[PDB]
JSON list of C-alpha atoms in Angstrom, two decimals:
[
{"chain": "V", "resi": 1, "resn": "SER", "atom": "CA", "xyz": [112.09, 53.50, 116.74]},
{"chain": "V", "resi": 2, "resn": "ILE", "atom": "CA", "xyz": [109.11, 55.44, 118.30]},
{"chain": "V", "resi": 3, "resn": "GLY", "atom": "CA", "xyz": [106.55, 56.00, 115.47]},
{"chain": "V", "resi": 4, "resn": "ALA", "atom": "CA", "xyz": [107.20, 56.64, 111.74]},
{"chain": "V", "resi": 5, "resn": "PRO", "atom": "CA", "xyz": [108.54, 59.88, 110.08]},
{"chain": "V", "resi": 6, "resn": "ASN", "atom": "CA", "xyz": [106.09, 60.55, 107.13]},
{"chain": "V", "resi": 7, "resn": "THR", "atom": "CA", "xyz": [107.87, 59.11, 103.95]},
{"chain": "V", "resi": 8, "resn": "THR", "atom": "CA", "xyz": [106.85, 62.27, 101.91]},
{"chain": "V", "resi": 9, "resn": "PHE", "atom": "CA", "xyz": [106.12, 64.99, 104.58]},
{"chain": "V", "resi": 10, "resn": "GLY", "atom": "CA", "xyz": [104.47, 68.35, 103.50]},
{"chain": "V", "resi": 11, "resn": "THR", "atom": "CA", "xyz": [102.31, 69.39, 106.55]},
{"chain": "V", "resi": 12, "resn": "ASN", "atom": "CA", "xyz": [105.33, 71.41, 107.84]},
{"chain": "V", "resi": 13, "resn": "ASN", "atom": "CA", "xyz": [108.32, 71.06, 105.40]},
{"chain": "V", "resi": 14, "resn": "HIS", "atom": "CA", "xyz": [110.69, 68.56, 103.63]},
{"chain": "V", "resi": 15, "resn": "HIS", "atom": "CA", "xyz": [112.56, 67.35, 106.79]},
{"chain": "V", "resi": 16, "resn": "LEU", "atom": "CA", "xyz": [112.78, 63.54, 107.36]},
{"chain": "V", "resi": 17, "resn": "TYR", "atom": "CA", "xyz": [112.15, 64.14, 111.11]},
{"chain": "V", "resi": 18, "resn": "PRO", "atom": "CA", "xyz": [109.26, 66.06, 112.88]},
{"chain": "V", "resi": 19, "resn": "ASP", "atom": "CA", "xyz": [109.70, 69.28, 114.99]},
{"chain": "V", "resi": 20, "resn": "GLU", "atom": "CA", "xyz": [112.21, 67.36, 117.24]},
{"chain": "V", "resi": 21, "resn": "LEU", "atom": "CA", "xyz": [114.77, 69.54, 119.14]},
{"chain": "V", "resi": 22, "resn": "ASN", "atom": "CA", "xyz": [118.53, 70.35, 118.85]},
{"chain": "V", "resi": 23, "resn": "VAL", "atom": "CA", "xyz": [118.98, 69.01, 122.49]},
{"chain": "V", "resi": 24, "resn": "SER", "atom": "CA", "xyz": [121.86, 66.90, 123.95]},
{"chain": "V", "resi": 25, "resn": "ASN", "atom": "CA", "xyz": [119.56, 63.83, 124.48]},
{"chain": "V", "resi": 26, "resn": "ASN", "atom": "CA", "xyz": [118.84, 63.86, 120.68]},
{"chain": "V", "resi": 27, "resn": "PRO", "atom": "CA", "xyz": [121.70, 62.05, 118.74]},
{"chain": "V", "resi": 28, "resn": "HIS", "atom": "CA", "xyz": [120.89, 64.45, 115.83]},
{"chain": "V", "resi": 29, "resn": "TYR", "atom": "CA", "xyz": [122.32, 67.29, 118.06]},
{"chain": "V", "resi": 30, "resn": "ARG", "atom": "CA", "xyz": [124.83, 69.57, 116.23]},
{"chain": "V", "resi": 31, "resn": "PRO", "atom": "CA", "xyz": [126.90, 72.63, 117.33]},
{"chain": "V", "resi": 32, "resn": "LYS", "atom": "CA", "xyz": [126.21, 76.19, 116.11]},
{"chain": "V", "resi": 33, "resn": "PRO", "atom": "CA", "xyz": [129.72, 77.11, 114.78]},
{"chain": "V", "resi": 34, "resn": "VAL", "atom": "CA", "xyz": [129.73, 80.91, 114.36]},
{"chain": "V", "resi": 35, "resn": "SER", "atom": "CA", "xyz": [132.62, 83.22, 113.33]},
{"chain": "V", "resi": 36, "resn": "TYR", "atom": "CA", "xyz": [133.04, 86.97, 112.61]},
{"chain": "V", "resi": 37, "resn": "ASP", "atom": "CA", "xyz": [135.34, 88.34, 109.81]},
{"chain": "V", "resi": 38, "resn": "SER", "atom": "CA", "xyz": [135.68, 92.10, 109.03]},
{"chain": "V", "resi": 39, "resn": "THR", "atom": "CA", "xyz": [136.75, 91.06, 105.45]},
{"chain": "V", "resi": 40, "resn": "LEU", "atom": "CA", "xyz": [132.99, 90.93, 104.55]},
{"chain": "V", "resi": 41, "resn": "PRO", "atom": "CA", "xyz": [131.05, 94.01, 103.20]},
{"chain": "V", "resi": 42, "resn": "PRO", "atom": "CA", "xyz": [128.78, 96.22, 105.45]},
{"chain": "V", "resi": 43, "resn": "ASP", "atom": "CA", "xyz": [125.38, 94.76, 106.56]},
{"chain": "V", "resi": 44, "resn": "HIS", "atom": "CA", "xyz": [126.28, 91.24, 105.18]},
{"chain": "V", "resi": 45, "resn": "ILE", "atom": "CA", "xyz": [126.28, 87.64, 106.59]},
{"chain": "V", "resi": 46, "resn": "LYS", "atom": "CA", "xyz": [128.16, 84.47, 105.39]},
{"chain": "V", "resi": 47, "resn": "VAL", "atom": "CA", "xyz": [126.28, 81.15, 104.91]},
{"chain": "V", "resi": 48, "resn": "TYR", "atom": "CA", "xyz": [128.00, 77.78, 104.37]},
{"chain": "V", "resi": 49, "resn": "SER", "atom": "CA", "xyz": [125.76, 75.15, 102.74]},
{"chain": "V", "resi": 50, "resn": "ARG", "atom": "CA", "xyz": [124.83, 71.88, 104.53]},
{"chain": "V", "resi": 51, "resn": "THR", "atom": "CA", "xyz": [122.88, 71.07, 101.28]},
{"chain": "V", "resi": 52, "resn": "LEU", "atom": "CA", "xyz": [123.95, 68.81, 98.46]},
{"chain": "V", "resi": 53, "resn": "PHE", "atom": "CA", "xyz": [122.55, 69.17, 94.94]},
{"chain": "V", "resi": 54, "resn": "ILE", "atom": "CA", "xyz": [122.18, 65.77, 93.27]},
{"chain": "V", "resi": 55, "resn": "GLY", "atom": "CA", "xyz": [122.25, 65.33, 89.45]},
{"chain": "V", "resi": 56, "resn": "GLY", "atom": "CA", "xyz": [121.91, 62.02, 87.52]},
{"chain": "V", "resi": 57, "resn": "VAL", "atom": "CA", "xyz": [118.96, 60.82, 89.70]},
{"chain": "V", "resi": 58, "resn": "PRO", "atom": "CA", "xyz": [117.18, 57.60, 88.53]},
{"chain": "V", "resi": 59, "resn": "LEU", "atom": "CA", "xyz": [113.40, 58.14, 88.79]},
{"chain": "V", "resi": 60, "resn": "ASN", "atom": "CA", "xyz": [112.95, 55.01, 91.00]},
{"chain": "V", "resi": 61, "resn": "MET", "atom": "CA", "xyz": [114.90, 56.53, 93.98]},
{"chain": "V", "resi": 62, "resn": "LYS", "atom": "CA", "xyz": [112.95, 58.57, 96.58]},
{"chain": "V", "resi": 63, "resn": "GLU", "atom": "CA", "xyz": [113.65, 60.78, 99.66]},
{"chain": "V", "resi": 64, "resn": "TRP", "atom": "CA", "xyz": [114.51, 57.75, 101.89]},
{"chain": "V", "resi": 65, "resn": "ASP", "atom": "CA", "xyz": [116.68, 56.20, 99.09]},
{"chain": "V", "resi": 66, "resn": "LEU", "atom": "CA", "xyz": [118.76, 59.43, 99.23]},
{"chain": "V", "resi": 67, "resn": "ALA", "atom": "CA", "xyz": [118.86, 59.06, 103.04]},
{"chain": "V", "resi": 68, "resn": "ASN", "atom": "CA", "xyz": [119.87, 55.34, 102.52]},
{"chain": "V", "resi": 69, "resn": "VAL", "atom": "CA", "xyz": [122.75, 55.94, 100.01]},
{"chain": "V", "resi": 70, "resn": "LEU", "atom": "CA", "xyz": [124.09, 58.82, 102.21]},
{"chain": "V", "resi": 71, "resn": "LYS", "atom": "CA", "xyz": [123.47, 56.88, 105.54]},
{"chain": "V", "resi": 72, "resn": "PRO", "atom": "CA", "xyz": [127.13, 55.57, 105.88]},
{"chain": "V", "resi": 73, "resn": "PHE", "atom": "CA", "xyz": [128.41, 59.09, 104.85]},
{"chain": "V", "resi": 74, "resn": "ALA", "atom": "CA", "xyz": [126.24, 61.37, 107.15]},
{"chain": "V", "resi": 75, "resn": "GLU", "atom": "CA", "xyz": [122.79, 61.97, 108.73]},
{"chain": "V", "resi": 76, "resn": "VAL", "atom": "CA", "xyz": [120.21, 63.45, 106.27]},
{"chain": "V", "resi": 77, "resn": "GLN", "atom": "CA", "xyz": [117.89, 66.15, 107.71]},
{"chain": "V", "resi": 78, "resn": "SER", "atom": "CA", "xyz": [115.76, 67.10, 104.64]},
{"chain": "V", "resi": 79, "resn": "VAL", "atom": "CA", "xyz": [115.29, 66.32, 100.90]},
{"chain": "V", "resi": 80, "resn": "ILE", "atom": "CA", "xyz": [113.39, 67.66, 97.84]},
{"chain": "V", "resi": 81, "resn": "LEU", "atom": "CA", "xyz": [113.58, 65.11, 94.99]},
{"chain": "V", "resi": 82, "resn": "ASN", "atom": "CA", "xyz": [112.29, 66.09, 91.51]},
{"chain": "V", "resi": 83, "resn": "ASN", "atom": "CA", "xyz": [112.12, 62.94, 89.28]},
{"chain": "V", "resi": 84, "resn": "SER", "atom": "CA", "xyz": [110.81, 65.03, 86.29]},
{"chain": "V", "resi": 85, "resn": "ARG", "atom": "CA", "xyz": [114.08, 67.10, 86.43]},
{"chain": "V", "resi": 86, "resn": "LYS", "atom": "CA", "xyz": [116.31, 63.98, 87.14]},
{"chain": "V", "resi": 87, "resn": "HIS", "atom": "CA", "xyz": [117.63, 65.73, 90.33]},
{"chain": "V", "resi": 88, "resn": "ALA", "atom": "CA", "xyz": [117.38, 66.05, 94.14]},
{"chain": "V", "resi": 89, "resn": "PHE", "atom": "CA", "xyz": [118.43, 68.50, 96.86]},
{"chain": "V", "resi": 90, "resn": "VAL", "atom": "CA", "xyz": [119.61, 66.91, 100.16]},
{"chain": "V", "resi": 91, "resn": "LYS", "atom": "CA", "xyz": [120.18, 68.85, 103.41]},
{"chain": "V", "resi": 92, "resn": "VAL", "atom": "CA", "xyz": [122.38, 67.18, 106.13]},
{"chain": "V", "resi": 93, "resn": "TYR", "atom": "CA", "xyz": [122.59, 68.49, 109.75]},
{"chain": "V", "resi": 94, "resn": "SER", "atom": "CA", "xyz": [126.23, 69.86, 109.59]},
{"chain": "V", "resi": 95, "resn": "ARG", "atom": "CA", "xyz": [128.68, 71.43, 107.09]},
{"chain": "V", "resi": 96, "resn": "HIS", "atom": "CA", "xyz": [131.30, 68.83, 108.13]},
{"chain": "V", "resi": 97, "resn": "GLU", "atom": "CA", "xyz": [128.80, 66.04, 107.28]},
{"chain": "V", "resi": 98, "resn": "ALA", "atom": "CA", "xyz": [128.06, 67.60, 103.83]},
{"chain": "V", "resi": 99, "resn": "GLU", "atom": "CA", "xyz": [131.82, 67.79, 103.05]},
{"chain": "V", "resi": 100, "resn": "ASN", "atom": "CA", "xyz": [132.28, 64.19, 104.39]},
{"chain": "V", "resi": 101, "resn": "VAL", "atom": "CA", "xyz": [129.57, 63.08, 101.88]},
{"chain": "V", "resi": 102, "resn": "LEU", "atom": "CA", "xyz": [131.19, 65.05, 98.95]},
{"chain": "V", "resi": 103, "resn": "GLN", "atom": "CA", "xyz": [134.69, 63.71, 99.86]},
{"chain": "V", "resi": 104, "resn": "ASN", "atom": "CA", "xyz": [133.78, 59.96, 99.62]},
{"chain": "V", "resi": 105, "resn": "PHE", "atom": "CA", "xyz": [130.50, 59.77, 97.61]},
{"chain": "V", "resi": 106, "resn": "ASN", "atom": "CA", "xyz": [130.82, 58.31, 94.09]},
{"chain": "V", "resi": 107, "resn": "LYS", "atom": "CA", "xyz": [134.70, 58.45, 94.09]},
{"chain": "V", "resi": 108, "resn": "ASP", "atom": "CA", "xyz": [134.83, 55.39, 91.73]},
{"chain": "V", "resi": 109, "resn": "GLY", "atom": "CA", "xyz": [132.16, 56.93, 89.40]},
{"chain": "V", "resi": 110, "resn": "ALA", "atom": "CA", "xyz": [129.84, 53.87, 89.91]},
{"chain": "V", "resi": 111, "resn": "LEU", "atom": "CA", "xyz": [126.76, 55.51, 91.58]},
{"chain": "V", "resi": 112, "resn": "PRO", "atom": "CA", "xyz": [124.17, 57.24, 89.28]},
{"chain": "V", "resi": 113, "resn": "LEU", "atom": "CA", "xyz": [123.93, 60.32, 91.60]},
{"chain": "V", "resi": 114, "resn": "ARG", "atom": "CA", "xyz": [126.20, 63.41, 91.04]},
{"chain": "V", "resi": 115, "resn": "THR", "atom": "CA", "xyz": [126.87, 65.16, 94.40]},
{"chain": "V", "resi": 116, "resn": "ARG", "atom": "CA", "xyz": [127.49, 68.96, 94.25]},
{"chain": "V", "resi": 117, "resn": "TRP", "atom": "CA", "xyz": [126.85, 71.94, 96.55]},
{"chain": "V", "resi": 118, "resn": "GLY", "atom": "CA", "xyz": [123.15, 72.84, 96.68]},
{"chain": "V", "resi": 119, "resn": "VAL", "atom": "CA", "xyz": [121.54, 75.55, 98.85]},
{"chain": "V", "resi": 120, "resn": "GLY", "atom": "CA", "xyz": [119.07, 75.33, 101.75]},
{"chain": "V", "resi": 121, "resn": "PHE", "atom": "CA", "xyz": [119.71, 79.04, 102.50]},
{"chain": "V", "resi": 122, "resn": "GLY", "atom": "CA", "xyz": [121.50, 81.34, 100.01]},
{"chain": "V", "resi": 123, "resn": "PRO", "atom": "CA", "xyz": [120.99, 84.42, 97.71]},
{"chain": "V", "resi": 124, "resn": "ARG", "atom": "CA", "xyz": [121.51, 83.56, 94.00]},
{"chain": "V", "resi": 125, "resn": "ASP", "atom": "CA", "xyz": [122.95, 87.05, 93.18]},
{"chain": "V", "resi": 126, "resn": "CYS", "atom": "CA", "xyz": [125.65, 86.66, 95.94]},
{"chain": "V", "resi": 127, "resn": "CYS", "atom": "CA", "xyz": [126.12, 82.84, 95.64]},
{"chain": "V", "resi": 128, "resn": "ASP", "atom": "CA", "xyz": [129.31, 80.74, 95.51]},
{"chain": "V", "resi": 129, "resn": "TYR", "atom": "CA", "xyz": [128.07, 77.21, 94.61]},
{"chain": "V", "resi": 130, "resn": "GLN", "atom": "CA", "xyz": [131.73, 76.27, 93.78]},
{"chain": "V", "resi": 131, "resn": "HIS", "atom": "CA", "xyz": [132.95, 76.71, 97.41]},
{"chain": "V", "resi": 132, "resn": "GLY", "atom": "CA", "xyz": [129.45, 75.82, 98.77]},
{"chain": "V", "resi": 133, "resn": "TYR", "atom": "CA", "xyz": [128.50, 79.14, 100.44]},
{"chain": "V", "resi": 134, "resn": "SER", "atom": "CA", "xyz": [126.69, 82.46, 99.86]},
{"chain": "V", "resi": 135, "resn": "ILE", "atom": "CA", "xyz": [126.96, 86.00, 101.36]},
{"chain": "V", "resi": 136, "resn": "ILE", "atom": "CA", "xyz": [123.62, 87.76, 102.16]},
{"chain": "V", "resi": 137, "resn": "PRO", "atom": "CA", "xyz": [122.92, 91.51, 102.64]},
{"chain": "V", "resi": 138, "resn": "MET", "atom": "CA", "xyz": [120.65, 92.12, 105.68]},
{"chain": "V", "resi": 139, "resn": "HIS", "atom": "CA", "xyz": [118.61, 94.63, 103.55]},
{"chain": "V", "resi": 140, "resn": "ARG", "atom": "CA", "xyz": [117.29, 91.64, 101.45]},
{"chain": "V", "resi": 141, "resn": "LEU", "atom": "CA", "xyz": [116.88, 89.23, 104.43]},
{"chain": "V", "resi": 142, "resn": "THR", "atom": "CA", "xyz": [113.10, 89.17, 105.16]},
{"chain": "V", "resi": 143, "resn": "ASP", "atom": "CA", "xyz": [111.68, 88.94, 108.70]},
{"chain": "V", "resi": 144, "resn": "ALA", "atom": "CA", "xyz": [111.52, 85.11, 108.19]},
{"chain": "V", "resi": 145, "resn": "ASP", "atom": "CA", "xyz": [115.10, 84.98, 106.74]},
{"chain": "V", "resi": 146, "resn": "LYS", "atom": "CA", "xyz": [116.65, 86.68, 109.82]},
{"chain": "V", "resi": 147, "resn": "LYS", "atom": "CA", "xyz": [114.22, 84.72, 112.10]},
{"chain": "V", "resi": 148, "resn": "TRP", "atom": "CA", "xyz": [115.76, 81.40, 110.91]},
{"chain": "V", "resi": 149, "resn": "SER", "atom": "CA", "xyz": [119.29, 82.87, 110.89]},
{"chain": "V", "resi": 150, "resn": "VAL", "atom": "CA", "xyz": [118.85, 83.57, 114.69]},
{"chain": "V", "resi": 151, "resn": "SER", "atom": "CA", "xyz": [116.18, 80.98, 115.80]},
{"chain": "V", "resi": 152, "resn": "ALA", "atom": "CA", "xyz": [116.91, 77.92, 113.53]},
{"chain": "V", "resi": 153, "resn": "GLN", "atom": "CA", "xyz": [117.78, 74.80, 115.49]},
{"chain": "V", "resi": 154, "resn": "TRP", "atom": "CA", "xyz": [120.38, 73.52, 112.99]},
{"chain": "V", "resi": 155, "resn": "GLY", "atom": "CA", "xyz": [122.57, 76.29, 111.50]},
{"chain": "V", "resi": 156, "resn": "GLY", "atom": "CA", "xyz": [122.38, 80.06, 111.99]},
{"chain": "V", "resi": 157, "resn": "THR", "atom": "CA", "xyz": [123.81, 81.96, 114.99]},
{"chain": "V", "resi": 158, "resn": "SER", "atom": "CA", "xyz": [122.54, 79.99, 118.09]},
{"chain": "V", "resi": 159, "resn": "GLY", "atom": "CA", "xyz": [120.21, 82.96, 119.01]},
{"chain": "V", "resi": 160, "resn": "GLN", "atom": "CA", "xyz": [122.87, 85.71, 118.56]},
{"chain": "V", "resi": 161, "resn": "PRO", "atom": "CA", "xyz": [121.96, 88.97, 116.72]},
{"chain": "V", "resi": 162, "resn": "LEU", "atom": "CA", "xyz": [122.90, 89.13, 113.03]},
{"chain": "V", "resi": 163, "resn": "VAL", "atom": "CA", "xyz": [126.00, 91.39, 112.90]},
{"chain": "V", "resi": 164, "resn": "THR", "atom": "CA", "xyz": [128.04, 92.47, 109.86]},
{"chain": "V", "resi": 165, "resn": "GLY", "atom": "CA", "xyz": [130.73, 89.84, 109.18]},
{"chain": "V", "resi": 166, "resn": "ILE", "atom": "CA", "xyz": [128.91, 86.92, 110.92]},
{"chain": "V", "resi": 167, "resn": "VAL", "atom": "CA", "xyz": [129.68, 83.43, 109.45]},
{"chain": "V", "resi": 168, "resn": "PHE", "atom": "CA", "xyz": [127.71, 80.17, 109.99]},
{"chain": "V", "resi": 169, "resn": "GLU", "atom": "CA", "xyz": [126.19, 77.07, 108.32]},
{"chain": "V", "resi": 170, "resn": "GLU", "atom": "CA", "xyz": [122.74, 77.47, 106.67]},
{"chain": "V", "resi": 171, "resn": "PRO", "atom": "CA", "xyz": [119.71, 77.97, 108.96]},
{"chain": "V", "resi": 172, "resn": "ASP", "atom": "CA", "xyz": [116.86, 75.45, 108.68]},
{"chain": "V", "resi": 173, "resn": "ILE", "atom": "CA", "xyz": [113.95, 76.18, 106.27]},
{"chain": "V", "resi": 174, "resn": "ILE", "atom": "CA", "xyz": [111.12, 75.70, 108.65]},
{"chain": "V", "resi": 175, "resn": "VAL", "atom": "CA", "xyz": [108.79, 78.77, 108.46]},
{"chain": "V", "resi": 176, "resn": "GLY", "atom": "CA", "xyz": [105.93, 78.52, 111.01]},
{"chain": "V", "resi": 177, "resn": "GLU", "atom": "CA", "xyz": [103.04, 81.04, 111.25]},
{"chain": "V", "resi": 178, "resn": "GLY", "atom": "CA", "xyz": [100.73, 81.87, 108.26]},
{"chain": "V", "resi": 179, "resn": "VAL", "atom": "CA", "xyz": [101.26, 84.70, 105.64]}
]
């Protein structure tokens, strides 16, 4: 209602919405579900994807067409569409939303889009794109990587320290600063 988003973004990052806030007055508010399992290796963290990878993309559909086809399935937070590759990546605000998309989307096989697990945050060498998660060693997490894992508004730990065995849904890929 108040103002327009951007329709392409790029000044900050590929989110549909501006800075906003994960506050209770925002209807985009989501919980920070965190767990701790000792079954994980030492100095590692678990990251569930809230990101869909999209194959089969017709070149005429854009970022807000992805938000439009997924609108009755879940709220879309961010999107990187690559028409030259015939694909998109689409980040929704919760893991439960991303599963609720995957569960109902293209069940008949009529839509051109092919919904899979993508990654907003995840190491390729410790990935599990089949289950839709990755496990990350804290020795490879940069200052920015841990900064989002603690400080990200959607996903991460809710401001808790990264401990061995910590589980959550992917932190936002804001960045801030220079460098």
